[PDB]
């Protein structure tokens, strides 16, 4: 409703860097808000794409940002009569970024890994990896829970059970308020998908450079399965956290599996031991139900509600014809120990191929009426196909069915405006939560400041 679409702020990265692929707000130890930006195709030392991360100080004028530096060199360790290898070429550092406390977590889902032993090998595969930074102190750490030293022959013998070679850990990411990092790895267990969790504190204290293979004892990984319903489900394509079991001491995980059960798609709510509490099934095959998930209490009863994006949902229209427009599903959490019922509200895109619901960002309470609100992206929506972000306001019965405000892309065609979103943080300290929108196609980020309601 009250985001200012006239005076925007623009941050920009190098051409072709995909600056703005991912982003988040970052508060330093003094509470000063900055913007961390991932640029997964930033050039490295060898003039080769490796990705990169930028930490943008808040300025109304915006502009260029300094780099948040990470080691981009390939590593090699000869130990235990084996040879460990990391490969950072085209690893996509900054394909996801998230901030917790005064720490930044930036991931490279497509970092490859291999282990050589004489003539055999583990196979060169994208286990993925995450880089952690404490900007103020300069502390650095890494986390790559899918790295292993098992040779190829062994996997073949055991029918590829517990095969974490293609995890792509960090594909998606989130951090609990308690400081537990949770990574989505959609390629885990031969593309079933898995989650990897570990306290940030333990990642730092257990990490040392040059080791490449080390234990994080406090970590917890999800489980493999023989059920074909999970095969190629990309469990962990998206991830989020919230409170859904009525126990405030426990933190529940929300996991998106957009190709679950032969591309039907699904979203699951689990406890911290990866035990399934609920499962939301997709409505339409190939709609990619679970591409994005969002957790926020929209109707002000103190109970977290669930939003799920299916950006490729085909709406039914006249003459038995279908139109790909995308759809968002709202699930209100019921009072006490009960299952999430049918959706409370269905929001459906309008523009053909607009991909409405590709991203869903909690905005907090934008208009300050006591109800939290959201922003939904249609990165190729709008009458021009340049992209749109639609704001929906909370209310006692859930969300409004019509948007209170629509943000048209200020960038050219192909910018993918709205592919990444983040809200619920007051960056200019005016008492209103603001919205940052990534447009990696244009290598830029737009900041929308919330203003007093008119």
């Amino acid at each position, epitope marked *: 409703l009250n985001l200012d679409p006239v005076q925007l702020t623009f941050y920009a990265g190098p051409n072709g860097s995909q600056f703005g692929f991912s982003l988040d707000f970052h508060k330093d130890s003094h509470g000063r808000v900055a913007i961390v930006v991932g640029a997964p195709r930033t050039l490295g030392p060898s003039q080769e794409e490796t990705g990169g991360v930028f930490l943008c100080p808040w300025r109304a004028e915006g502009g260029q940002c300094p780099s948040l530096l990470f080691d981009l060199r390939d590593e090699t*360790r*000869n*130990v*235990g*009569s084996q040879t460990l290898q990391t490969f950072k070429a085209r690893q996509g550092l900054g394909a996801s970024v998230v901030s917790w406390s005064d720490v930044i977590v930036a991931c490279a889902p497509w970092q490859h890994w291999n282990v050589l032993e004489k003539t055999e090998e583990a196979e060169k595969t994208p286990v993925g990896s995450c880089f952690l930074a404490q900007p103020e102190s300069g502390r650095r750490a890494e986390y790559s829970p899918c790295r292993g*030293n098992t040779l190829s022959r*062994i996997y073949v013998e055991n029918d590829f059970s517990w095969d974490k070679r293609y995890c792509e850990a960090g594909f998606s990411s989130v951090v609990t308020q308690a400081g537990e990092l949770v990574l989505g790895a959609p390629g885990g267990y031969y593309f079933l998908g898995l989650l990897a969790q570990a306290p940030v504190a333990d990642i730092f204290s*257990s*990490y*040392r450079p*040059g*080791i490449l*293979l*080390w*234990h*994080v*004892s406090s970590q917890s990984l999800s489980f493999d399965s023989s059920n074909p319903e999970y095969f190629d489900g990309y469990w962990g394509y998206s991830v989020a956290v919230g409170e859904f079991d009525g126990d405030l001491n426990t933190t529940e995980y929300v996991v998106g599996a957009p190709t679950w059960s032969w591309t039907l798609g699904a979203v699951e709510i689990l406890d911290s031991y990866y035990q399934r509490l609920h499962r939301l099934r997709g409505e339409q095959m190939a709609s990619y139900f679970g591409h994005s998930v969002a957790v926020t209490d929209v109707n002000g009863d103190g109970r977290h509600d669930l939003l799920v994006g299916a950006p490729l949902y085909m709406e039914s229209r006249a003459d038995r014809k279908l139109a790909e427009v995308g759809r968002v599903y709202l699930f209100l959490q019921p009072r006490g120990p009960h299952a999430l019922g049918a959706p409370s509200l269905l929001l459906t895109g309008t523009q053909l191929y607009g991909r409405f619901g590709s991203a869903i960002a909690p905005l907090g309470d934008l208009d300050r009426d006591g109800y939290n609100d959201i922003a939904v992206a249609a990165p190729y929506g709008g009458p021009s196909g340049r992209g749109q972000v639609l704001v929906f306001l909370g209310q006692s019965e859930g969300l409004r069915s019509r948007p209170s405000q629509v943000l048209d892309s200020p960038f050219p065609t192909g910018s993918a405006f709205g592919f990444s979103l983040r809200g619920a943080v007051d960056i200019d300290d005016n008492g209103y939560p603001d919205l940052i929108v990534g447009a990696y196609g244009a290598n830029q980020v737009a900041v929308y400041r919330a203003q007093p309601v008119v």
Partner: antibody
Framework: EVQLQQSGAELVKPGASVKLSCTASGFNIKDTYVHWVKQRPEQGLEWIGRIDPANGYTKYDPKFQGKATITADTSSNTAYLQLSSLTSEDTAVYYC????????????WGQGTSVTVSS | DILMTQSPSSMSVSLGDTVSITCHAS??????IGWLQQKPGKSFMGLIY???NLVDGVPSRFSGSGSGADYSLTISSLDSEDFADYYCVQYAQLPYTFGGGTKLEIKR
């Protein structure tokens, strides 16, 4: 806290066999490699082998191939070292070992099990 | 197998001294070395791993260094508890092999 608690001292005859145990305390035995090391006053420390209790795969120093047999039961959270066709030279102290962080290291040690072969 | 030649076999020193134990491998092991401590009539405790990294709980007066095929364990300001046996171990290659050992004794 990580503690490796081994079995009591063994007193056996030559030609017989013995099976030492190494029970994990405060952690899952399945987490890391578990090694076995032999110590004698003169010969000093010698590496017997290792086992990955998550799958049961083992490695051995070719010197101990035949006598040493390392196994593990994740149920009882315990690793074992079986010694066969015992000899006076098998009279030694045996330690079970695991790493802290580094996959290949040798950081945490059990108290050691004393073995004595005699007629 | 990789031979680990540890020296000296023993040394007579006093409290507060800064001593250094060395270890020579028959070939390069690239910091894939660990240092161990065995107090009189007791089990082993890990000091260093990967050449220079302190095991959790170990005092900072301990420190490892070196590269290639030559490494060192240093103890700044000896404490009454530091008088014990010290071994090095390489895990660059299987089978793991140990040094001969070094015993720190009280000088008088």
């Amino acid at each position: 806290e990580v503690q490796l608690q081994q079995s009591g001292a063994e007193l056996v005859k030559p030609g017989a066999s013995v099976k030492l145990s190494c029970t994990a305390s405060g952690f899952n035995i399945k987490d890391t490699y578990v090694h076995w090391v032999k110590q004698r006053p003169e010969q000093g420390l010698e590496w017997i082998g290792r086992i990955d209790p998550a799958n049961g795969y083992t490695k051995y120093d070719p010197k101990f191939q035949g006598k040493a047999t390392i196994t593990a039961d994740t149920s009882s959270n315990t690793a074992y070292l079986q010694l066969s066709s015992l000899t006076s030279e098998d009279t030694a102290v045996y330690y079970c070992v695991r790493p802290l962080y580094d996959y290949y290291a040798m950081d945490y040690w059990g108290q050691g099990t004393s073995v004595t072969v005699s007629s | 197998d990789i031979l680990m030649t540890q020296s000296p076999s023993s040394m007579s020193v006093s409290l507060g001294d800064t001593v250094s134990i060395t270890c020579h491998a028959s070939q390069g092991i690239s910091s894939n070395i660990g240092w161990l401590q065995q107090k009189p009539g007791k089990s082993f405790m890990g000091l260093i791993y990967y050449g220079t990294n302190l095991v959790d709980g170990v005092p900072s007066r301990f420190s490892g260094s070196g590269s290639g095929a030559d490494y060192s364990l240093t103890i700044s300001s000896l404490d009454s508890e530091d008088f014990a046996d010290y071994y090095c171990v390489q895990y660059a290659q299987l089978p793991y092999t140990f040094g001969g050992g070094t015993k720190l004794e009280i000088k008088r």
